[PDB]
């Protein structure tokens, strides 16, 4: 019986608020090292993100930003975080709104109620070896619905550069429209999120968020739990059809859910009609 070994004490090398250990109790694969862990997005060419402090929409709150008068809350109709930093039960989990967190131009304090993503990782996670899906990420604790988990962090690239990347297993489109659109590639540079698998029955959802800048080309991708998550559960999101339409020729979904849409069995049945 193969034992579970701790093979890294912290894949983040102390860059996150908490350690993120790696274990393996399935095979002899060592800690993954074919990438560079970064805790914040990086650039490898000039993106000219608008960082002019005078361009920030900002609030005039002298509160903790829990009132309906916070301009930053109003930019998403309302602030969607409760007193504990969790999305409200009424949050649209299907088509999420764009969240504008408070920033350096607001009059409020750094610990106001509208600063959840910018405060970083608080839940305890683990990188671990799965049976059929390579590395994955699981919870080391219960996570209530609506809790911020982590951000999809990597290398900011253009749509045209994404189109010729040899490895297409870690590309996240920031915008689904035409024209001047950008992508996070977590292949070479990434954080823990690069290890999050696709699940046809997902328990986290990506949400576009603005913090220190409000350049609409460059939303940051924040994952929040979409339900209560039990200790030990693997984290997963729906990658979407812009992933599986290309990838299904190379491999099929191993998530193993009754709801699976992307397994060999699902695909063959749909072919059949």
């Amino acid at each position: 019986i193969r034992t579970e070994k701790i093979i890294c004490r912290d894949v983040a090398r102390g860059y996150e608020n908490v350690p993120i250990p790696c274990v393996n109790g399935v095979d002899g694969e060592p800690c993954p090292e074919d990438y560079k862990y970064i805790s914040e997005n990086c650039e490898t060419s000039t993106m000219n993100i608008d960082r002019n402090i005078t361009h920030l929409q900002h609030c005039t709150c002298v509160d903790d930003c829990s009132s309906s008068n916070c301009l930053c809350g109003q930019l998403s109709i309302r602030c969607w975080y409760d007193k504990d930093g969790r999305l409200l039960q009424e949050f649209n989990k299907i088509e999420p709104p764009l969240i504008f967190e408070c920033n350096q131009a607001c009059s409020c304090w750094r610990n106001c109620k509208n600063r959840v993503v910018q405060s970083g990782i608080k839940v305890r996670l683990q990188l671990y070896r799965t049976a059929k899906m390579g590395w994955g990420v699981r919870a080391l604790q219960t996570i209530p619905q609506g809790t911020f988990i982590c951000e999809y962090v990597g290398e900011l690239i253009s749509d045209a550069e994404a189109d010729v990347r040899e490895d297409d297993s870690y590309l996240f489109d920031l915008d689904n429209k035409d024209g001047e659109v950008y992508c996070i590639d977590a292949r070479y540079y990434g954080n823990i999120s690069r290890f999050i698998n696709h699940l046809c029955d997902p328990n986290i959802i990506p949400v576009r968020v603005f913090m220190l800048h409000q350049d609409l080309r460059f939303p940051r991708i924040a994952f929040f739990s979409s339900r209560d998550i039990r200790t030990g559960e693997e984290l997963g999101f729906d990658y979407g059809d812009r992933f599986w339409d290309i990838k299904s020729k190379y491999f099929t979904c191993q998530c193993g859910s009754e709801k699976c849409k992307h397994s060999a069995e699902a695909i063959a049945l749909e072919q059949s009609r």
Partner: peptide
């Protein structure tokens, strides 16, 4: 597109 993209 020519490459697979995760997306919202």
């Amino acid at each position: 597109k020519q490459t697979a993209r995760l997306s919202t």
